[PDB]
Amino acid sequence: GAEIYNKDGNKLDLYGKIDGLHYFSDDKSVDGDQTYMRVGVKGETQINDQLTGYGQWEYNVQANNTESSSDQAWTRLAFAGLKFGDAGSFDYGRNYGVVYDVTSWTDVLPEFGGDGDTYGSDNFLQSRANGVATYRNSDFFDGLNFALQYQGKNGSVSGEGATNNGRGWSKQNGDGFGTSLTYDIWDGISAGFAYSHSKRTDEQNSVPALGRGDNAETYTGGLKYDANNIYLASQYTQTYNATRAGSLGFANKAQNFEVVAQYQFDFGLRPSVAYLQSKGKDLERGYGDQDILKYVDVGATYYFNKNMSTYVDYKINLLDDNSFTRNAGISTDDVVALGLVYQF
Amino acid sequence: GAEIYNKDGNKLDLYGKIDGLHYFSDDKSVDGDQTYMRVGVKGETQINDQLTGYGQWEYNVQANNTESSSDQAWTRLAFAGLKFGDAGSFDYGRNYGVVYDVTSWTDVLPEFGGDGDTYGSDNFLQSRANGVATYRNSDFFGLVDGLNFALQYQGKNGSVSGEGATNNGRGWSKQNGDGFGTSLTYDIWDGISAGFAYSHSKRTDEQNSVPALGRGDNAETYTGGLKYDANNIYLASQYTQTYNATRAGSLGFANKAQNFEVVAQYQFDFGLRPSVAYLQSKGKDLERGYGDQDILKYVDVGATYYFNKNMSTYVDYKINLLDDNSFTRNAGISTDDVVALGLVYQF
Amino acid sequence: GAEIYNKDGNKLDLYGKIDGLHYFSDDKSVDGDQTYMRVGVKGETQINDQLTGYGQWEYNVQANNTESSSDQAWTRLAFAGLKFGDAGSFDYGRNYGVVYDVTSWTDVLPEFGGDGDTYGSDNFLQSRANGVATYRNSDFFGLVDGLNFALQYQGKNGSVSGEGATNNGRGWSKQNGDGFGTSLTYDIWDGISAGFAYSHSKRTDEQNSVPALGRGDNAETYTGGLKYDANNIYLASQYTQTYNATRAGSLGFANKAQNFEVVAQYQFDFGLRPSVAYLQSKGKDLERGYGDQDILKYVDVGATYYFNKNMSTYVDYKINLLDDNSFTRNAGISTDDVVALGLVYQF
Structure with missing residues (x-):
């Protein structure tokens, strides 16, 4: 972040990055140049x-x-x-759903991980979301952070279930709420819990083949160690009608686990290893139980300074290629990423 | 505000806002989250x-x-x-048509009003437009304080292809032929102002052939307006008569229309600013049996609370007075009420 | 320019322009408003x-x-x-292919010239390109002053789907296989420069199957250029020979092409800069009976007035010398003249 204005009690911070990024993979929808900026x-x-x-x-x-x-x-x-x-804060707009207050703890891989993996964006209150009203409180009116969040319906493009800002069923939601709680038990050690409940939409219960139910729910618990140049964190989430079974719908229930270990050397190298899985249960069309996501991640970032870094990341995909992964468009191939990043 | 660069005779002002906004309405095309930023x-x-x-x-x-x-x-x-x-100023690009030098006087509602209501964007010289050349003069060459005028030219912005096309083609509703406009405002006191504006554009072939409603070679607007802005009081009115220029929803243009807008506001010292307004657009001589039709009609009541120059919050309540009829349904014109709630950061 | 941040060894420069621009032409896909910003x-x-x-x-x-x-x-x-x-520099991203290290010498017209004429963007390593890794060396390891070279690799950018796909797929016209290029430039005297560039890319199966024009496994370019820049005079030429690499409008690629650009300019002290230029592109061995064809041919006259480093105005007149034929019509190649007027604010 670069402070480009600070005058008369108003401050303006410009921030972002240019990520020169290449992916290598046999999955042709992933392989190739991936350069982007924020x-x-x-x-x-x-x-x-x-x-x-x-x-x-x-x-x-x-x-x-x-x-x-x-x-x-x-x-x-x-x-x-x-x-x-x-005494806390309130904001309205497009922002992170409070579930991420805990799942963010495992979202620290050099490149992979985070939204797109066990959960996605525009995915109830699991990540970034339209129309969230968020009340937050530090030190519970000590060191205990609380959030309460409401989200209005984001519905279909047209018909009964429409709102102004309509979209496909995969990114729809009804009226919903979430709450999170995080605490520093020791110095360096944190624990966290989060819950969300949202109404589903009529299109979510009629257009895709997978996932039926009136409500989507998430229960998350997470732990984090972050001291002594060591970073450990895990996240365990259980969901009902909330996790995406690729392009086929939602999973009636799923169990998502994410764990990561990292070390930060003084001279700037930061190796990383992680394991992610998503287990879907009670799927329609004869699918039953199915792996949605399963991989080991290894890689490293070298930080030249706070403004420039390079990284490699290797996704070792453990999914078996079957009827579910093909039909739902879930990749089973490995990926290697190489990047060079300027940040301001 | 936000001057981020001022050096060797060059300055750069970065401005904008982040508007956290939600609409409540039975109209499903309007209802829900409306967050946006500029x-x-x-x-x-x-x-x-x-x-x-x-x-x-x-x-x-x-x-x-x-x-x-x-x-x-x-x-x-x-x-x-x-x-x-x-001696004046000249600019070319995407800019406000000069009609808005007067109609802007009523575009002060907490959330509603302005473009989308009695006029829209890319709607001849009534609001923001492509390819306007604008000459402006303030205080009549320095000789008459408070007297301002503008002269404006707009090149044709035509169809996507065919005979009537330009490089930057668009649908008939946002097309225009060659056109010009003029405005004139006078501050009689330092709070009271009067103003007039006129525009004349050629219509394009698609405007006469594709939609059902509105026929004519020319689009014309005549606008008069009044403004009181002092002693914490704000009163403003604007009257505009149009020919082949006012959109009849999705059905075309109104051969003639009468638009009226009026608004009253008061700025309390602690930062609250209540607002009442009335807006209407009456269309005349519509084809296909429609005859005379209301295009827009509502009363607006709301308020803005300014925390400071960088942050505010507002409510706005559009009490819709249109009858739901064949015209309004076929033209896609909303007849439902709307409430807006917003929180705005500005820089 | 506009350094908006410089603190603790980190610098940020915000740059751009607002170019209010109009084209006049009988070619309706070019004619009209062209305002843009960067x-x-x-x-x-x-x-x-x-x-x-x-x-x-x-x-x-x-x-x-x-x-x-x-x-x-x-x-x-x-x-x-x-x-x-x-020891040099390395960057990866969307950047200029190295061929433009030499052809840019003729990209100095008031408005026309450059990408869109004898070459385009997303056109192997001739202009801006997705996924280029670029090594650059200055003054040949600090030893030979004025001698610069560059080495460049580009990964495959393939089809949207099927066997040739990559994540970032596009049309055959903007596809490439694996490729490399190299450039070399030398300031022989002060003011005088010579330069060479070469590139070699695999072509994709869509480029060899979907369009009717152009066949071959490899796309290649060879470029030589000269430049005089001193005493308020600017002269430059570029000659480029291509294989399977020059677009034959919308119909495909030319199996061979010869491209030539030359420009002459003078800078007067009071800010006027007149310009005259000639550009041609000659396509050889085109399928479907097209044979030898002019892809591009025009004389360019114009001028820019610089008010200062932040503001300028300009006119450019493209005098089109192509004959209208069945190739120009089917390929979408304009044969009409065009005048451009622009007013530019830069920061």
Whole structure:
């Protein structure tokens, strides 16, 4: 983040990165150039002694396709808020669902991991989401962070279930809420829990073959060790009608586990190993139990300084190629990524 | 505000906002999350004692849809110009048609009003438009304080292909032929103002052949308006008569229309700013049996609370007065009420 | 320019322009408003005494169409890199192919010329390209002053689907296989420069099956250029011979092509810069009975007035010498003349 303005109680921070990134894989929908950049602004205005206003915007711009390609930029974050001293905060807009307050702890791989793996974006309150109202509280009115979050319906393009901002069933949601709780038990050791409950939409219960139910729910617990140049974290999440069974629908229930170990050398190298799986249960069309995601991750980042880094990441895919993985379009091939990153 | 660069006669102002916004309505095409942000840059360069060069860009970025959605960002303004002291200024690009130099006086509602209501964008010289050349003069060459005028030309913006095409083609509703416009505002006191604007554009072939409604070779607008803005009080009205220029929803254009807007506001010292307004658009001589039809009719009541110059919150309540009829249904015109709630950070 | 951040060994430069631009032409796909803007960031971080890290992004935003139009913005450049003192530099991203290290010498017309004429973007290593790794060496390891060379590799950018696919698939016209290129330039005197460039890329199976024109496993370019730049005079020429690498409009590629560009300019002290140029592209051995064909042929006359480093105005007149024939019609190649007028704010 680069502070480009700070005057009369108003500050403006410009941030972002250019990620020169290549993927190597037998999966042709993944293989090739993946260069992209992100640009954002964080703004803060002092209102009074007990009140600060703020806003943030984060934009993703792909740079790996041609100058006539379409749909190459999208907003990741866009929200405005009030901070009432230390007595917490409120914001509304496109922001992270509170489930990520805990699952973010395993989202630290050099390249892979995070949204797209055990959960996705626009996926109820599991990641970035449209129309979230988020109340947060530090030190529970000590060191104990609480959030409560509401999300209005984001429905179909047209018909009964429509809203202004309609989309496909995979990215729809009804009215929902979430809550998170995180705590530093020792110095360095944190624990966290999160819960979300959302109504599903009529299209989610009629267009895809997989996943039926009135409500989507997530229960998450997570642990993190972050001291002494060591980073360990795990996340265990159980879901009902909330995890995507590739292109085929949702899984009636799923169990997602993510664990990672890393070490940070003084001279800037940071090796990383991780394991991720997603186990879907009670799937329609005779699928039954099925692996949705399963891989070991190894790689490393070298940090030249706080503004420049290079990395390699290797996804060792353990999924077996079967009828479910083919029909749902889930990749079973390995991937290697190489990148060079400038950040500001 | 936000001057991020001011060095050797060149300055750069980065401005914009992040508007956390939700609509509540029985209209499903309007209801729900409406979060969006604006970002722009105002730049100015001193060339010599008598000559300043400038440009401005303004972009709108929706944040209310997904990361795989289409067409979520667009340019509102992009223009470059020269200012020659009190001999006037000239700019070319995407800019406001001069009609808006008067109708902007009523575009002060907490959330509603403005483009989308009695006029829209890419709607001849009524709002933001492609390819306008605009000459402006303030205080009549420095000789008459408070007297401003504008002269404006717009090149044809035509079909996607065929005979009527230009490089930058669009659908008939946002097309225009060659056109011009003029405006004139006068500050009688330092709070009271009167203003007039006129425009005349050629219509294109698609505007006369594709939609069912509206026939004619020319689009004309006549606008008069009044404004009181002082002593914490804001009263403004605008009356506009149009010919082949006002959209009849998706069905075409109204052969003639009468648009009226009026608004009253008060700014309390602690930062609350209530607002009441009334807006209507009456269409006349519509084809296919429609005859005279209301295109828009509503009362608006709301309020903005300014925390400071960088942060506000607002409610706005559109009490819709249209009857649900054959015209409104076939033209895609909303007849439902709307409530808006917003929280806005601005820089 | 516009250094908006410089602190603790890290620098950020915000650059761009707002170009208010109109084209006049009988060619209706070219005629009309062409206003656009560019915005960019050049970033630099000192890592140690011998090593600098850097990144650059450049975005093109059209402003000549409506707020509901599609595909109005795109990335021209996006790359990250390391500079190793005088051992050289390495960057990867969307960047210029090295052939343009020489052909850029003739890309100096007031408005026309450059990509879109004798070569295009996403056209192997002739202009801006996805996925280029580029090594550059200055002054031949600090030894021979004015001698620069570059070595470049590009990975496959393939079809949207099927056997030839990559993640970032596109049309046959903008596809490439694995490829490499090299450039060499030398300032023989001050003001005078010579340069060579070569490139070799595999072609894709879609390029050899979908369009009717152009067959071969490999695309190749050979380029030589000269430049005089001194005493307020600018002269430059570029000659390029290509194999399976030059677009024959929409119909495919030319099995062989010969491209030639030459330009002459003078800079007057009061800011006027007149320009005259000639560009041709001659295609050989085209299938379907086309044979030898002119792909491009025009004389260019124009001028730019620089008010200062931040503002300019210009006119350019393309005098088109192509004869209208069945090749030009079917390939979509314009044979009409065009005048451009522009007013530009730059930061």
